[PDB]
Write a protein that holds these residues in place. Sequence first.
Motif, PDB file in Angstrom:
ATOM      1  N   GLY A  44     -50.247  48.941  95.915  1.00 55.63           N
ATOM      2  CA  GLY A  44     -51.572  48.372  96.080  1.00 55.63           C
ATOM      3  C   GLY A  44     -51.872  48.020  97.524  1.00 55.63           C
ATOM      4  O   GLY A  44     -50.975  48.005  98.366  1.00 55.63           O
ATOM      5  N   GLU A  45     -53.138  47.728  97.808  1.00 52.88           N
ATOM      6  CA  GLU A  45     -53.575  47.429  99.168  1.00 52.88           C
ATOM      7  C   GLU A  45     -52.947  46.153  99.720  1.00 52.88           C
ATOM      8  O   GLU A  45     -52.715  45.192  98.984  1.00 52.88           O
ATOM      9  CB  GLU A  45     -55.102  47.317  99.222  1.00 52.88           C
ATOM     10  N   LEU A  46     -52.672  46.159 101.022  1.00 53.64           N
ATOM     11  CA  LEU A  46     -52.118  44.997 101.708  1.00 53.64           C
ATOM     12  C   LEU A  46     -53.079  43.815 101.639  1.00 53.64           C
ATOM     13  O   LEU A  46     -54.282  43.970 101.846  1.00 53.64           O
ATOM     14  CB  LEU A  46     -51.804  45.338 103.167  1.00 53.64           C
ATOM     15  N   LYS A  47     -52.545  42.635 101.346  1.00 54.13           N
ATOM     16  CA  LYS A  47     -53.377  41.449 101.186  1.00 54.13           C
ATOM     17  C   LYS A  47     -53.795  40.864 102.528  1.00 54.13           C
ATOM     18  O   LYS A  47     -52.951  40.498 103.345  1.00 54.13           O
ATOM     19  CB  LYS A  47     -52.646  40.386 100.366  1.00 54.13           C
ATOM     20  N   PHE A  48     -55.103  40.778 102.746  1.00 59.51           N
ATOM     21  CA  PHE A  48     -55.641  40.167 103.956  1.00 59.51           C
ATOM     22  C   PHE A  48     -55.382  38.665 103.959  1.00 59.51           C
ATOM     23  O   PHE A  48     -55.548  37.995 102.941  1.00 59.51           O
ATOM     24  CB  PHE A  48     -57.142  40.447 104.082  1.00 59.51           C
ATOM     25  N   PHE A  49     -54.980  38.147 105.115  1.00 59.34           N
ATOM     26  CA  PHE A  49     -54.748  36.719 105.302  1.00 59.34           C
ATOM     27  C   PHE A  49     -55.569  36.206 106.485  1.00 59.34           C
ATOM     28  O   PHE A  49     -55.540  36.797 107.564  1.00 59.34           O
ATOM     29  CB  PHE A  49     -53.256  36.440 105.525  1.00 59.34           C
ATOM     30  N   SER A  50     -56.305  35.117 106.282  1.00 60.01           N
ATOM     31  CA  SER A  50     -57.072  34.507 107.366  1.00 60.01           C
ATOM     32  C   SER A  50     -56.140  33.792 108.338  1.00 60.01           C
ATOM     33  O   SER A  50     -55.008  33.460 107.990  1.00 60.01           O
ATOM     34  CB  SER A  50     -58.112  33.528 106.818  1.00 60.01           C
ATOM     35  N   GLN A  51     -56.619  33.555 109.556  1.00 63.50           N
ATOM     36  CA  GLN A  51     -55.819  32.886 110.577  1.00 63.50           C
ATOM     37  C   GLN A  51     -55.510  31.439 110.208  1.00 63.50           C
ATOM     38  O   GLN A  51     -54.481  30.895 110.607  1.00 63.50           O
ATOM     39  CB  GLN A  51     -56.531  32.932 111.933  1.00 63.50           C
ATOM     40  N   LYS A  52     -56.402  30.817 109.443  1.00 69.22           N
ATOM     41  CA  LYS A  52     -56.250  29.407 109.100  1.00 69.22           C
ATOM     42  C   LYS A  52     -55.614  29.187 107.733  1.00 69.22           C
ATOM     43  O   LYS A  52     -55.392  28.046 107.326  1.00 69.22           O
ATOM     44  CB  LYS A  52     -57.605  28.696 109.154  1.00 69.22           C
ATOM     45  N   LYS A  53     -55.322  30.267 107.019  1.00 67.66           N
ATOM     46  CA  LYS A  53     -54.673  30.123 105.724  1.00 67.66           C
ATOM     47  C   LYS A  53     -53.174  29.928 105.930  1.00 67.66           C
ATOM     48  O   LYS A  53     -52.429  30.894 106.107  1.00 67.66           O
ATOM     49  CB  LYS A  53     -54.955  31.333 104.836  1.00 67.66           C
ATOM     50  N   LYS A  54     -52.714  28.699 105.766  1.00 71.06           N
ATOM     51  CA  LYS A  54     -51.317  28.345 105.913  1.00 71.06           C
ATOM     52  C   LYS A  54     -50.386  28.982 104.883  1.00 71.06           C
ATOM     53  O   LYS A  54     -50.794  29.248 103.775  1.00 71.06           O
ATOM     54  CB  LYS A  54     -51.197  26.832 105.906  1.00 71.06           C
ATOM     55  N   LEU A  55     -49.151  29.261 105.299  1.00 68.96           N
ATOM     56  CA  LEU A  55     -48.144  30.003 104.528  1.00 68.96           C
ATOM     57  C   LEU A  55     -47.089  29.215 103.705  1.00 68.96           C
ATOM     58  O   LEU A  55     -46.838  28.048 103.931  1.00 68.96           O
ATOM     59  CB  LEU A  55     -47.376  30.949 105.448  1.00 68.96           C
ATOM     60  N   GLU A  56     -46.477  29.908 102.754  1.00 69.78           N
ATOM     61  CA  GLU A  56     -45.297  29.440 102.049  1.00 69.78           C
ATOM     62  C   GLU A  56     -44.077  29.464 102.961  1.00 69.78           C
ATOM     63  O   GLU A  56     -44.004  30.235 103.903  1.00 69.78           O
ATOM     64  CB  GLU A  56     -45.020  30.314 100.813  1.00 69.78           C
ATOM     65  N   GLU A  57     -43.103  28.628 102.641  1.00 68.26           N
ATOM     66  CA  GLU A  57     -41.864  28.618 103.385  1.00 68.26           C
ATOM     67  C   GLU A  57     -41.241  29.957 103.139  1.00 68.26           C
ATOM     68  O   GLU A  57     -41.349  30.489 102.061  1.00 68.26           O
ATOM     69  CB  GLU A  57     -40.945  27.470 102.930  1.00 68.26           C
ATOM     70  N   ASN A  58     -40.596  30.506 104.147  1.00 67.60           N
ATOM     71  CA  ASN A  58     -40.022  31.836 104.040  1.00 67.60           C
ATOM     72  C   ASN A  58     -41.009  32.990 103.810  1.00 67.60           C
ATOM     73  O   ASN A  58     -40.668  34.006 103.219  1.00 67.60           O
ATOM     74  CB  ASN A  58     -38.910  31.859 103.020  1.00 67.60           C
ATOM     75  N   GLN A  59     -42.213  32.818 104.327  1.00 69.04           N
ATOM     76  CA  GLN A  59     -43.177  33.879 104.476  1.00 69.04           C
ATOM     77  C   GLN A  59     -43.306  33.995 105.967  1.00 69.04           C
ATOM     78  O   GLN A  59     -43.031  33.048 106.677  1.00 69.04           O
ATOM     79  CB  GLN A  59     -44.531  33.483 103.910  1.00 69.04           C
ATOM     80  N   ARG A  60     -43.669  35.169 106.450  1.00 66.20           N
ATOM     81  CA  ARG A  60     -44.056  35.337 107.843  1.00 66.20           C
ATOM     82  C   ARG A  60     -45.057  36.453 108.051  1.00 66.20           C
ATOM     83  O   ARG A  60     -45.135  37.383 107.277  1.00 66.20           O
ATOM     84  CB  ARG A  60     -42.851  35.563 108.733  1.00 66.20           C
ATOM     85  N   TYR A  61     -45.791  36.341 109.146  1.00 66.09           N
ATOM     86  CA  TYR A  61     -46.738  37.348 109.567  1.00 66.09           C
ATOM     87  C   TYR A  61     -46.020  38.633 109.862  1.00 66.09           C
ATOM     88  O   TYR A  61     -44.923  38.642 110.375  1.00 66.09           O
ATOM     89  CB  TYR A  61     -47.429  36.909 110.825  1.00 66.09           C
ATOM     90  N   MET A  62     -46.671  39.726 109.520  1.00 66.50           N
ATOM     91  CA  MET A  62     -46.167  41.068 109.783  1.00 66.50           C
ATOM     92  C   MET A  62     -46.265  41.384 111.273  1.00 66.50           C
ATOM     93  O   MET A  62     -47.294  41.135 111.901  1.00 66.50           O
ATOM     94  CB  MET A  62     -46.943  42.105 108.968  1.00 66.50           C
ATOM     95  N   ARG A  63     -45.191  41.926 111.839  1.00 65.08           N
ATOM     96  CA  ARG A  63     -45.176  42.270 113.254  1.00 65.08           C
ATOM     97  C   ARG A  63     -45.817  43.635 113.491  1.00 65.08           C
ATOM     98  O   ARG A  63     -45.963  44.433 112.561  1.00 65.08           O
ATOM     99  CB  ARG A  63     -43.748  42.259 113.797  1.00 65.08           C
ATOM    100  N   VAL A  64     -46.199  43.892 114.739  1.00 69.23           N
ATOM    101  CA  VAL A  64     -46.801  45.167 115.116  1.00 69.23           C
ATOM    102  C   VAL A  64     -45.871  46.332 114.789  1.00 69.23           C
ATOM    103  O   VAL A  64     -46.304  47.347 114.241  1.00 69.23           O
ATOM    104  CB  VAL A  64     -47.153  45.204 116.622  1.00 69.23           C
ATOM    105  N   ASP A  65     -44.589  46.175 115.109  1.00 68.85           N
ATOM    106  CA  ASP A  65     -43.628  47.250 114.893  1.00 68.85           C
ATOM    107  C   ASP A  65     -43.472  47.545 113.403  1.00 68.85           C
ATOM    108  O   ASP A  65     -43.294  48.695 113.016  1.00 68.85           O
ATOM    109  CB  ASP A  65     -42.271  46.914 115.528  1.00 68.85           C
ATOM    110  N   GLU A  66     -43.566  46.509 112.572  1.00 71.63           N
ATOM    111  CA  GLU A  66     -43.485  46.676 111.123  1.00 71.63           C
ATOM    112  C   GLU A  66     -44.693  47.425 110.571  1.00 71.63           C
ATOM    113  O   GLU A  66     -44.556  48.296 109.713  1.00 71.63           O
ATOM    114  CB  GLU A  66     -43.364  45.320 110.425  1.00 71.63           C
ATOM    115  N   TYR A  67     -45.877  47.072 111.061  1.00 69.27           N
ATOM    116  CA  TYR A  67     -47.108  47.713 110.611  1.00 69.27           C
ATOM    117  C   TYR A  67     -47.116  49.201 110.937  1.00 69.27           C
ATOM    118  O   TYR A  67     -47.617  50.013 110.159  1.00 69.27           O
ATOM    119  CB  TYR A  67     -48.328  47.039 111.243  1.00 69.27           C
ATOM    120  N   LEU A  68     -46.557  49.555 112.088  1.00 71.28           N
ATOM    121  CA  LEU A  68     -46.618  50.930 112.565  1.00 71.28           C
ATOM    122  C   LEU A  68     -45.726  51.884 111.766  1.00 71.28           C
ATOM    123  O   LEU A  68     -46.011  53.077 111.699  1.00 71.28           O
ATOM    124  CB  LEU A  68     -46.255  50.990 114.051  1.00 71.28           C
TER     125      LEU A  68
END
Lengths: 349, 74
Positions: free
Chosen positions: A264-288
């Motif tokens: 399924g499609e990647l879930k969009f996350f807003s800049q101000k939507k705070k995360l769960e512990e042990n979640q992290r933003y996807m890096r550029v190298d990962e996206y590519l």
Amino acid sequence: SVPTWNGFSLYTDETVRNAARYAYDNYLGKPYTGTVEATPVNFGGQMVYRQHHGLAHTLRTMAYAEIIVEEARKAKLRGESLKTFADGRTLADVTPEELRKIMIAQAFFVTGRDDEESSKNYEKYHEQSRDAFLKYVEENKSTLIPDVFKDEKDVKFYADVIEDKDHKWADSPAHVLVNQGHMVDLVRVKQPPESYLEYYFSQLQPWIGSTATEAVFATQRQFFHATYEAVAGFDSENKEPHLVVDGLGRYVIGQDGNPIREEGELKFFSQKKKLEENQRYMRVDEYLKLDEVQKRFPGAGKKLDGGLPGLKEYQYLQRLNSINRARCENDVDFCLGQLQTAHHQTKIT
Amino acid sequence: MQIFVKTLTGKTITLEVEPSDTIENVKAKIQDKEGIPPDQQRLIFAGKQLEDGRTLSDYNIQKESTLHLVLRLR
């Protein structure tokens, strides 16, 4: 398969160059009257009023239009199937007379600005851009109608494209070229460069194909060098967070090795939507190396340094600071000369 | 503590920093490695440009974070 050409070109057509001169003399060469970055620069010696959205920017958009159509034509002749408009035409089916009218519209696209304000003056600024375009036509009816614009209805169409009151950025070749031409010029400033390049690439690719799109951004880099504008770096191993350009958001890795998807499609996350512990933003190298990105974006694993070979940051900056950049921002002929040189450079050898 | 400063031209400035050197100082730290006069500096974090007189831990920048350095013509 492809419409017969006039010998028409941004670099030789007098009508298009006249519109650019007019746009500079009466708007782009004038001081900003707003307050956001409205202060002028004395480029090592002379004044530049609108370093960002000025003459060199405007001419580059027009140059983008020329190369996008050029590459679209070659793409159609290769037998590639490009995205169509409602009338069945692709960007490869743009006529010389049509491209001329588009470029004239492009010349006026940011004349209406009063400063570099990002958001709250959008409608006002394009209205004043539209008004400038209509004023220029009115002052030159004798030569422009019917020889360039068929009539007032024709004039109105391009006035509306400039106006952009409803944001129909894909309604026609004029809409696509004016808006994407304006948009792709942001490569000169946006970070992370990898995120923005992938984005703009994917915006253009359906219209002209992958091979044509690569040629556009490769040529753009030389357009930037020739007009003393910054050339971005590209590192496929960039570890900074990937930026979801549409909506200025993020993608997130959960506790799974996997990234979070909708259903399924990647879930969009807003800049101000705070995360769960042990979640992290996807890096550029990962996206590519995402398989869907690998398939659509051929430059996903590339490593290509920016700036110029042999120059360090402040040296490169000092080059972008020189009087020659000011000459590009204040002399229509000189800037067009530079663009023409970069446009045809690969064809000499 | 280390932070990362990225330029458009694709350079990653690894800085050695402590939680609240004000933003003048980091801009002064940048001047010492690349020679860039603070006059011409614009530092961005989370899409926000860091006004000076303020400082790092105020903007909540912890280890391994990434900032953007945007150059201004003079």
